[PDB]
Amino acid sequence: SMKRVQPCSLDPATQKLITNIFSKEMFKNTMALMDLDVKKMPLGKLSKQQIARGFEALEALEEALKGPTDGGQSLEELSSHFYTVIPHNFGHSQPPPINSPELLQAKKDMLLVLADIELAQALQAVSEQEKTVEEVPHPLDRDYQLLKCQLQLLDSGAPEYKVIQTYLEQTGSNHRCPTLQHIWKVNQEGEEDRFQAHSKLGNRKLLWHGTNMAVVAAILTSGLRIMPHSGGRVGKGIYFASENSKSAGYVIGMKCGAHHVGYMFLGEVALGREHHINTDNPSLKSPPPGFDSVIARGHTEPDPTQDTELELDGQQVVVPQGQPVPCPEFSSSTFSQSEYLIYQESQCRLRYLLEVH
Ligand SMILES: Nc1cccc(C(=O)O)c1
């Protein structure tokens, strides 16, 4: 009647990772950090229906702002409906009206993180198979297995290790530099086949993508995604940076013991033919008709003369190794650092996960 729990197959670093990215405490923290009222909206009550209602409430708001003053509901009443469907906590004061584009997108981005938290919870549901088997995996093996994604810890003499480390150091912040703890090689399967469909596409680069810890299990499961309400300064696709310090800005870590722990991806991005912009355009949904990517060009760029290459599944993939240098032609760009954009999920492939302190 009592099921055997099998020993854990996972090395220490991977156990800690898998513990971190499925941690209930980490999830709640992320909710409290987004002003969500965890008491009225607990992890196990979190639902796809509810997130869906939240987005519609947001949609109603966007029509309100981006529309004119017809006879519709005020922003106050429409905000209030949103806050009924997605309960927020602001020390038991009335939450603020969502009454600017900035605020609207901030709330979309929140609901996108929460969706990925619900994804993790959904993923952890116990199947009926699992009730019937008389031995179970170690809980960390089960959780790793749920990702359907391969993770291989790199040690310091792996062929790519020094390349990645140099990428990190040279393009990370000079003073407040992220401390490298571990690198995992990442192979989500079936990501492989969408990516094979861009194989005659050249101009591949390994690019940073920072995220909060709460979406890391979602990304390892499903890839980086372009969701319906996602957006930003270069519109509706997947954001990457050649400067670690840029992507580090979007990492949301958690205090663990004496450390603040955070996670960072490197994606192989098939940029093909690049279209360079120098002003924000949040409406972009694809590159211009000849092009495969949009690069919002920064004041600086890792010194291309120091670029190296890495052979990934037989393809040349460029890895910058130089410190940022000025790019005279983009000195008046609205972008201090470059933002690399692709507008279809198939154009990127997860290659590495980094733990940094
Ligand atoms: N906006 C933006 C630009 C570049 C990288 C990132 C990131 O998520 O790492 C975000």
CATH code, domain carrying 131:
1.20.142.10
Q: Contact, 298 vs 208, CB < 8 A?
A: no
CA of 337 to the centre of ligand 1 (A): 10
User: Which 8-state DSSP code applies to residue 67?
Assistant: S
Q: Which one of 147, 177, 197 terminates a domain?
A: 147
Q: State the chain's maximal CA–CA distance in angstroms.
A: 72
Amino acid type, 65: L
Of the candidates 325, 354, 348, 308, the one whose C-alpha atom is nearest the C-alpha of residue 243 is 325
Measured distance CA(105)–CA(291) in Å, rounded: 27
Task: Locate all alpha helices (DSSP H) within 224-310, ordered by sequence.
Answer: 244-248
For residues 74 and 6, membership in a common domain is answered with: yes
Axis crossing angle, helix 101-124 with helix 139-146, rounded to the nearest 10? 120
Q: Which atom of ligand 1 is nearest to the CA of 247?
A: 9
**Residues 24 and 212: beta-carbon distance below 8 Å:** no
The two tokens of residue 349 are: 């492939």
Neighbour count for residue 199 (Cβ, 10 Å) = 11
| Terminal CA-CA length for the chain | 44
Q: Is the CB of 79 under 6 A from ligand 1?
A: no
Catalytic residue ranges:
339
3-state secondary structure of 3: coil
**Which amino acid appears at position 108 of this protein?**
K
Domain count, the chain: 2
Residue nearest to atom 10 of ligand 1 (CA): 239
111 and 158 share one domain:
no
Residue 235 Cβ < 6 Å to ligand 1: no
> Residues 274, 342: contact at Cβ < 8 Å?
no
CA dihedral (43, 47, 51, 57) positive or negative: negative
Query: In terms of DSSP H, where are the helices of the chain?
Result: 12-22, 24-33, 48-66, 75-85, 101-124, 128-132, 139-146, 161-171, 191-196, 216-222, 244-248
Last residue of a domain, one of 127, 147, 167: 147
| Ligand 1 close to Cβ of residue 109 (< 6 A) | no
Q: How far is the CA of 349 from the centre of ligand 1 (A)?
A: 16
C-beta 262 within 6 A of ligand 1 = no
Alpha carbon distances (Å) from 27 to 42, 120, 213, 269, 282:
10, 10, 8, 29, 29
To test the pocket of ligand 1, the residue of 112, 205, 247, 294 to mutate (highest count of ligand atoms within 8 Å of its CB) is 247
The answer on 63 and 49 residing in a single domain is yes
Name residues whose C-beta falls within 8 Å of residue 185's C-beta, 6 or more positions apart in sequence: 150, 151, 152, 154, 158, 160, 351, 352
One domain, residues 94 and 12? yes
Give the C-alpha separation, 300 to 303, whole Å.
9
Method: X-ray
Q: Does residue 248 sit in the same domain as residue 230?
A: yes
Q: How far is the CA of 339 from the centre of ligand 1 (A)?
A: 6
What string of DSSP letters covers 300-324?
A: EEE-GGG-EEEEETTEEEEE--SPE
Residue position matching structure tokens 């004061």 = 93
Task: Tell whether 86 and 200 lie within a shared domain.
Answer: no
301 and 219 belong to one structural domain: yes
Distance separating alpha carbons of residues 43 and 116, to the nearest angstrom: 12
Atom of ligand 1 nearest to the CA of 340: 4
Same domain, 153 and 298: yes
Distance CA 294, CA 343 (A): 8
For residue 55, the number of C-alpha atoms closer than 13 Å in the C-beta half-sphere is 16
Cβ pair 175, 332 in contact under 8 A: no
Are 269 and 223 a contacting pair, CB within 8 Å? no
3 burial class (0-12, 13-18, 19+ CB within 10 angstroms)?
exposed
Contact 250 CB / ligand 1 (< 6 Å): yes
Coil, strand or helix at 271 = coil
CATH number of the domain that 315 lies in?
Answer: 3.90.228.10
Residue 5 shares a structural domain with residue 53: yes
Final residue belonging to a domain, choices 147, 162, 185: 147
Resolution, Å (one decimal):
2.3
Asked if 315 and 223 sit in the same domain, the reply is: yes
Joined tokens for residue 60: 């109603």
Q: Do residues 261 and 254 lie in contact, with contact meaning Cβ atoms separated by under 8 Å?
A: yes
Burial grade of 164 (CB within 10 A; 0-12, 13-18, 19 or more): buried
Q: Whose CA is nearest to atom 1 of ligand 1?
A: 239
Q: Does residue 135 contact residue 280 with C-beta atoms inside 8 Å?
A: no
Sheet holding 293-296, edge to edge: 238-240, 339-342, 293-296, 274-277
Ligand 1 close to Cβ of residue 299 (< 6 A): no
Query: How many Å lie between the centroid of ligand 1 and the Cα of residue 247?
Result: 5
Examine the domain organization and report whether 95 and 203 are in the same domain.
no
Bridge partners for 316 per DSSP: 311
For the record, the structure tokens of 333 come out as: 């760009």
Structural contact between residues 120 and 218, judged by C-beta atoms closer than 8 angstroms: yes
Range of the domain at 82: 1-147
